[PDB]
Amino acid sequence: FTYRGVDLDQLLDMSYEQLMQLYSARQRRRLNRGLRRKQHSLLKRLRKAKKEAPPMEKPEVVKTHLRDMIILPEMVGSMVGVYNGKTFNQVEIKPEMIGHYLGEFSITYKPVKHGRPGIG
Amino acid sequence: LVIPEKFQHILRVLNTNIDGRRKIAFAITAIKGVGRRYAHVVLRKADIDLTKRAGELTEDEVERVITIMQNPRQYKIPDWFLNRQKDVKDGKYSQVLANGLDNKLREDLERLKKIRAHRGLRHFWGLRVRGQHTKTTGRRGRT
Amino acid sequence: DKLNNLVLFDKATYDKLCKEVPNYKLITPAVVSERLKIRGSLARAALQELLSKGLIKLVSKHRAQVIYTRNT
Amino acid sequence: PGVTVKDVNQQEFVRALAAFLKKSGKLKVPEWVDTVKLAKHKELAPYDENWFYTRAASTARHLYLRGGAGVGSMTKIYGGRQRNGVMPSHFSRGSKSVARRVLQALEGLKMVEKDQDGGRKLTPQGQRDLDRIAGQVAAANKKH
Amino acid sequence: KVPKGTSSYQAEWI
Amino acid sequence: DIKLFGKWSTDDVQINDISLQDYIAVKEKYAKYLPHSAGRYAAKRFRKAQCPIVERLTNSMMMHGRNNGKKLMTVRIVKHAFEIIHLLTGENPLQVLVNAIINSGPREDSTRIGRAGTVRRQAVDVSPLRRVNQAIWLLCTGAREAAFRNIKTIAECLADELINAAKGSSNSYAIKKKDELERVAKSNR
Amino acid sequence: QSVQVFGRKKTATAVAHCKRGNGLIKVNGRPLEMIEPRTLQYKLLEPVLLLGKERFAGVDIRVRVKGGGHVAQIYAIRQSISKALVAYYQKYVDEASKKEIKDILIQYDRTLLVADPRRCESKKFGGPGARARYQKSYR
Amino acid sequence: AAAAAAAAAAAAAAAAAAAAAAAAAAAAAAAAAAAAAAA
RNA sequence: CCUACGCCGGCAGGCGCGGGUAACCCGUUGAACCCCAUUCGUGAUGGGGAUCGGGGAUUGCAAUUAUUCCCCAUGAACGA
């Protein structure tokens, strides 16, 4: 896999400053704004949960509310429950989603599949 | 005007029948991936007068147009007239035309289906993507 | 159906445009365009050429209405 | 009877002042001459291959018509009607960098002078030149 | 081909 | 002296019908340089009988929706139309205009008289001022609907329809609808 | 030696300053052909073509125009030129030729010398403007 | 001088149109007073 | 927070520098249509720009279900 001409080992070995030219307009915008302490702590729980896993095993899923989290490429390979109001949807963070938010992966409502009109 | 004797009544540029009698600055728009502004900023560097038509040309003009048209950075069509700025793979500032245009639209849709994102399932279902107010619309093309 | 009028000249097209035009009582780019399957761009440039031919009087001249007139 | 630029047809004066700037040949010409529109509120490219020249001529003349107008006022003169899609049209202004660097390029020819008053006005060289070309087009008017 | 992680919710979006 | 558009003459103009002779004001002191008057003429009753004829052809030509203040397009359409009629005929085109308005207005007209449900019409006489206005409206309408989708400029269309109705063709929409109301007049009585 | 009058449509003001001069007509430094709504030039030429330029022989006529729109400014300049010539011949020449030129202008068109009685009026609450009001629905 | 006079006349005309002059003056005075108060 | 002026931005915008707690400073509140020239030429076309794919910049704790604005490309219906 390659993103913007940069590889996965190349991205994961790249510093936090040099990421901030490789993203979208909103994403470079928010990384200019600087992350919050809640998201720092969530990434710290992700570090603890991705490290202590057995080496054959995928890490333990961490559930979270923060739908407005930028999917950093350091999160790739984890499993995260995303809260959409009712239900933590458990997404395996694959490397194809490094330029998106978590909030699009737990689709919030149920699709309208119509019935029939009664008394209109 | 005059009666140009080399007048191809059919043009075939990049898998597209072009109505060669149409104006040159509006017959390049006919293919996908090229609009009106873009073919103009091509022709201002492709060094062809706008007064002529599209069937009044030399193939040397045609080959330099396609040369500039596939090499958009090397002939000063800089990186905002381009159809794709930063691709997912290479991030290369590059123009994308008709067959590759449908190919890369299909690529992004297949990707977002594979991503399992909020966009990708809309695009598989063929619905509105930009959050529209469908309390009165959704009429023509729904069954 | 298709009003895909002739974009460039022809043999017989110019054989009518150099010939039949100064015998109309009214020379209008829409009229010359309309009688012989010619786009108004082509007839408009042709009527400016008929200024350069000197056969035909120019009476009115505007943005989109330029009136020509057969002589004598 | 010192002839006035205001006593001539203004757009024939613009076309002749464009031809006068073409015959001059000396000016720092920028490089986005073949790229850009005038501003956001138009759709297509201009057809003129010398549109920089005639806009510089008209900009010098609008400086002649009033002194005390900066780039923002030069932006504001060259405004127009943005069509906002299906949403209704609005007034939208010119482009800052283009009009600023037109004033800068004609400032290179000592035809545009920065003042104490903040704006830019015409040089006395400039009013001499415009009254000369005004007499040229005035002889092109009252003697044609 | 429902993922082993996610719920029935996003699977009804599939 | 006073000539239309700098050149066009008005003293040659002659009215045929005495029944319409006062309700077109063109001849002596209602000749002006332009149709653009910009004074009130709908002030009270019959004050749009003493307004000039070409002003009426002008002000009844911005009729459609998108043109509804753009009188300067209308006066150049009038100017180009007079020049086209002056080419295709040679005479003073104001005489063609007067002969076109005279030959186009209805002579009997049908009016529903009864109740709302008794459509039993009665063909009655046409008032002269309404004959004038009906003629102007028919000429403008023939200029409109024959110039919707064409190559012809609407000045050309107005000029050619004014020519065709001035001679009473089977080609003028105005003369077609005059003959229609005159034939409906035969039916209701 | 000078007369100072004006002309007024809706918003257009036309200040006229005339005196003994040479036949000079400046409209803020431009002639009476250099006003881009040019067909109305003939209306703008109605003070000269009705009266003859020989009656505008030795008069300086300065025109300074304010406000309004283009057609309103044209009728204001027409207004102000006619009132300026009439006021000049009243203050400095006889009553008889002034009265005669007044009768030439008015019997042609009264709007040349008198004002317009109407403007874009103010609004009484309840609609877009004064007369038409908002729209509703039934059922 | 003539030009100045013309300008003045124009201004007067404008004022009249707006109207009236007295009223304007009064308004100006009021504004001044307000400014003073603010200060 | 209304802005002028200057500098840097192909376009949205930044940076420096005053007035204005206000008929003053923005403000002469320098607008749109309109007009005069150019191009197009009656067809789904350059009309209509929806519907979208890439980006870019601001607003903000927070733009993912497109906040908004901008730049390419897409060009459906619609024939009164």
Coordinates of C-alpha atoms (C1' of nucleotides) in Angstrom, one line a residue, chain B residues 29 31-38 80-86 108 118-119 127-131, chain I residues 10 39-41 45-46 51-56 64-68 71-77:
Chain B
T29 CA -14.8 20.3 -24.0
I31 CA -14.6 14.7 -24.3
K32 CA -14.7 13.9 -20.6
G33 CA -12.1 15.3 -18.3
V34 CA -11.8 18.6 -20.3
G35 CA -14.2 21.5 -19.8
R36 CA -14.2 25.0 -21.2
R37 CA -11.6 26.9 -19.1
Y38 CA -9.2 24.0 -19.3
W80 CA -5.0 23.9 -10.2
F81 CA -6.4 23.4 -13.7
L82 CA -5.7 19.7 -13.1
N83 CA -8.5 17.2 -12.8
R84 CA -6.8 15.4 -9.9
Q85 CA -4.4 17.1 -7.5
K86 CA -3.3 14.6 -4.9
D108 CA -12.5 5.7 -5.5
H118 CA -20.4 6.6 5.2
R119 CA -19.8 7.6 1.6
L127 CA -28.2 8.1 -3.4
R128 CA -27.4 11.7 -2.5
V129 CA -24.0 12.2 -0.8
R130 CA -23.8 15.8 0.2
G131 CA -26.5 15.7 2.8
Chain I
rG10 C1' -3.0 32.0 -10.0
rU39 C1' -17.6 35.8 -29.8
rC40 C1' -21.5 32.3 -30.3
rG41 C1' -26.0 31.0 -34.3
rU45 C1' -25.3 23.5 -28.1
rG46 C1' -21.0 27.3 -24.9
rU51 C1' -25.8 15.5 -9.5
rC52 C1' -20.2 14.3 -7.9
rG53 C1' -14.7 13.1 -8.0
rG54 C1' -9.9 15.4 -6.5
rG55 C1' -7.8 19.4 -3.9
rG56 C1' -7.1 24.6 -1.4
rU64 C1' -17.1 13.5 9.2
rU65 C1' -24.1 13.4 7.0
rA66 C1' -20.4 17.6 2.0
rU67 C1' -20.3 24.7 7.9
rU68 C1' -19.0 28.3 4.4
rC71 C1' -10.0 26.1 -8.2
rC72 C1' -10.3 21.9 -12.1
rA73 C1' -13.5 18.0 -14.0
rU74 C1' -18.8 16.0 -14.3
rG75 C1' -22.8 18.1 -17.2
rA76 C1' -29.0 15.1 -15.9
rA77 C1' -34.0 17.1 -16.2

